[PDB]
C-alpha cells in the first residue's frame, strides 16, 4: 500500500460536496473499537454516490462548527437486496462530545482504495488506521489543504 493517493492538484469528479444528518449505524459500536465511525443519513447519498465507486475516500468534514480532515467508506446496505447506499465517515483527530442528529457537511477531495474482504476485527482496525495516514499525508499539499476554508464550510 502507498502512502498517499491521487494528484498533487485535485481532479474531477472531486470536489464532491453534499451534507447529511449523523444517524444511528447499526449496533456495531465502533466508539469502543477506538475508531468511531458517523452513518450518514441514506437519504443524502443515494444518488449523489449511486454511480460512484464504493471504498473509502478522503478529505473534509464538518460538524458542530467545526472543520477535520476525514475518511469516508461508502458501500451498500446489507438489509435489502436493491442497491441501498450507505456511507461512514471518521473525523480525523478530533476531540468532543457526540454529534447525533446533527447536519454533517462533507467534502470528498479523493479515492484511497477499494473495500476489501471483511477479515476480522484487528486487520480492519490496521486498514483504518493506514487509511488515515494515508489522508492526511493526502491533504497535506497545497490544492487539497486549501478545501479546508473552503465557502462550503462558511
Ligand atoms: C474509513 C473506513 C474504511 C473501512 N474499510 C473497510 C474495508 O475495506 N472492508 C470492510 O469490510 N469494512 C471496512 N470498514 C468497516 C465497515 O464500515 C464496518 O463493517 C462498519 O461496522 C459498518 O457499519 P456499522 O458499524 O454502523 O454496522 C471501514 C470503515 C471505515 C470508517
Ligand atoms: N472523531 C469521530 N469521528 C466519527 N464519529 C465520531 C467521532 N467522535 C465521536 N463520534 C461519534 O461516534 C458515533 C459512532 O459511534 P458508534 O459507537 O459506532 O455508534 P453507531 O454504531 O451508531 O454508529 C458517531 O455517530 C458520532 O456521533
Do not use: C
Not at 465511525?37 to 444518488?47: G, K, L, R, V, W
Amino acid at each position: 500500500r502507498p502512502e498517499i493517493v491521487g494528484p498533487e492538484k485535485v481532479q474531477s469528479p472531486y470536489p464532491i460536496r453534499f451534507e447529511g444528518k449523523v444517524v444511528h449505524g447499526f449496533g456495531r459500536g465502533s466508539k469502543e473499537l477506538g475508531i468511531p465511525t458517523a452513518n450518514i443519513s441514506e437519504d443524502a447519498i443515494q444518488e449523489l454516490l449511486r454511480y460512484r465507486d464504493s471504498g473509502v475516500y478522503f478529505g473534509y468534514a464538518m460538524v458542530q462548527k467545526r472543520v477535520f480532515p476525514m475518511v469516508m467508506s461508502v458501500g451498500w446496505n446489507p438489509y435489502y437486496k436493491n442497491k441501498l447506499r450507505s456511507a461512514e465517515v471518521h473525523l480525523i483527530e478530533r476531540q468532543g462530545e457526540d454529534f447525533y442528529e446533527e447536519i454533517m457537511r462533507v467534502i470528498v477531495l479523493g479515492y484511497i482504495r477499494p473495500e476489501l474482504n471483511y477479515a476480522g476485527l484487528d486487520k480492519l482496525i490496521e486498514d483504518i488506521h493506514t487509511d488515515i495516514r494515508v489522508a492526511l499525508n493526502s491533504m497535506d499539499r497545497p490544492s487539497y489543504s486549501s478545501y479546508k476554508k473552503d465557502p462550503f464550510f462558511k
